[PDB]
Amino acid sequence: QWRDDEVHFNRTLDSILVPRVVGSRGHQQVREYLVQSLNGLGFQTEVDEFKQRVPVFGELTFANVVGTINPQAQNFLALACHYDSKYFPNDPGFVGATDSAVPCAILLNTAKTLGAYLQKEFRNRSDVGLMLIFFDGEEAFKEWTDADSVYGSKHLAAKLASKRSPRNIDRIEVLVLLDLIGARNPKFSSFYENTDGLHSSLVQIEKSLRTAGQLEGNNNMFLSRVSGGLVDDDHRPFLDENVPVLHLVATPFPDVWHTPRDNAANLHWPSIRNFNRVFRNFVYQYLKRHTSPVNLRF
């Protein structure tokens, strides 16, 4: 029943798909664009801004952007991406199309396509709300290590853990983190036993949409298997606080990952479209079905 809005998606992606290393002009423009976009989609918007010294550049100002609908709800579904792009000395024009402009565009477009629900009937409840989290400073400035990585996520997890209104971080039922989406024929495996039921939901929704003739082409992206390895990402500081994670990161990685080829020209629209159809229904169904607190901390 939920229709595509590809005009919105495209125009959103165009607005984000600019060089946006933390501290750059493009990063500032994207931050402002995210905040404006969230406000216009009906979210209560907050920015978690902070300074931190990193390799190469010294002190930089980071800002996570968080939008919430039903901020006084008991629990939250949280959907996330990173909005910074990776600094490359020899590639100042790097735009990280899959990493993670498309992921961020997907979250905003999910909010757009379900707007008739999110901005109306969904507001009339106290059991669940929706959080969209745009992490800053996911990328290493010199070399990915536990230290040089995920600066925004580290800060936001600490912030959410340090507040009570139970701890704010504890009201997050699951962190659904989208990364490395946009390439052709992506494959998503379940990383964690505790969110396998949610993964199974994605699989079932994709099967159902295919049977209804609603998917483009012949690939299925949601695999019914547990992945044998893990991908380090923005959810690490949330694991550290026992938050359940559904990690929607394609493996294998896009061919273009961390190369000058991670651009608009190498995106695969039919895959993006299929992702959006499954994902928007997954989010709607999670919210629609919710009654009691979902407790996947096991």
Ligand X SMILES: COc1ccc(NC(=S)NCCCn2ccnc2)cc1OC
Ligand Y SMILES: *[C@@H]1O[C@H](CO)[C@@H](O[C@@H]2O[C@H](CO)[C@@H](O)[C@H](O)[C@H]2NC(C)=O)[C@H](O)[C@H]1NC(C)=O
Q: Which is nearer to Zn ion, 43 or 87 (CB)?
A: 87
- Our separate counts of H helices and E strands in the chain read 8, 8
Orientation angle between helical segments 102-113 and 6-16, nearest 10 degrees: 140
Q: Is 7 in the site for ligand Y (CB under 6 A)?
A: yes
Among ligand X, Zn ion, ligand Y, none, what does residue 10 contact (CB within 5–8 Å per kind)? ligand Y
Among ligand X, ligand Y, Zn ion, none, what does residue 234 contact (CB within 5–8 Å per kind)? none
CB 240 within 8 A of CB 157: yes
Residue 147: CB minimum distance to ligand Y, A: 38
| CA atoms of 176 and 79, how far apart (whole Å) | 5
Q: Which amino acid belongs to residue 165?
A: S
Burial of 191 (0-12, 13-18, 19+ CB in 10 A): buried
Among ligand Y, ligand X, Zn ion, none, what does residue 136 contact (CB within 5–8 Å per kind)? none
Catalytic site residue 138? yes
- Residue 133, CB-side half-sphere exposure with 13 Å CA sphere: 29
Q: Which is nearer to ligand Y, 7 or 116 (CB)?
A: 7
Q: Is 84 in the site for Zn ion (CB under 5 A)?
A: no
Stretch that binds ligand Y, among 5-13, 87-95, 144-152, 286-294 (CB under 6 A): 5-13
Q: Which is nearer to ligand X, 33 or 191 (CB)?
A: 191
277 in a known ligand binding site = no
Among 179, 206, 234, 262, the one annotated catalytic: 179
Stretch that binds ligand Y, among 4-12, 135-143, 145-153, 281-289 (CB under 6 A): 4-12
Instruction: State the residue for tokens 């701890």.
Output: 167
Interface positions, 89-148, toward Zn ion (CB under 5 A):
99
125 in a known ligand binding site = no
Q: Which is nearer to ligand X, 57 or 167 (CB)?
A: 57
Q: Is 253 in the site for ligand X (CB under 6 A)?
A: yes
Q: Is 233 in the site for ligand X (CB under 6 A)?
A: yes
Going by DSSP bridges, is the β-strand pair 58-69/44-54 parallel, antiparallel, or unpaired? antiparallel
CB 132 within 8 A of CB 111: yes
| CA atoms of 290 and 220, how far apart (whole Å) | 27
CB 228 within 8 A of CB 247: no
Catalytic residues: 138, 179
Residue numbers of the site for ligand Y (CB under 6 A)?
6-7, 10, 269
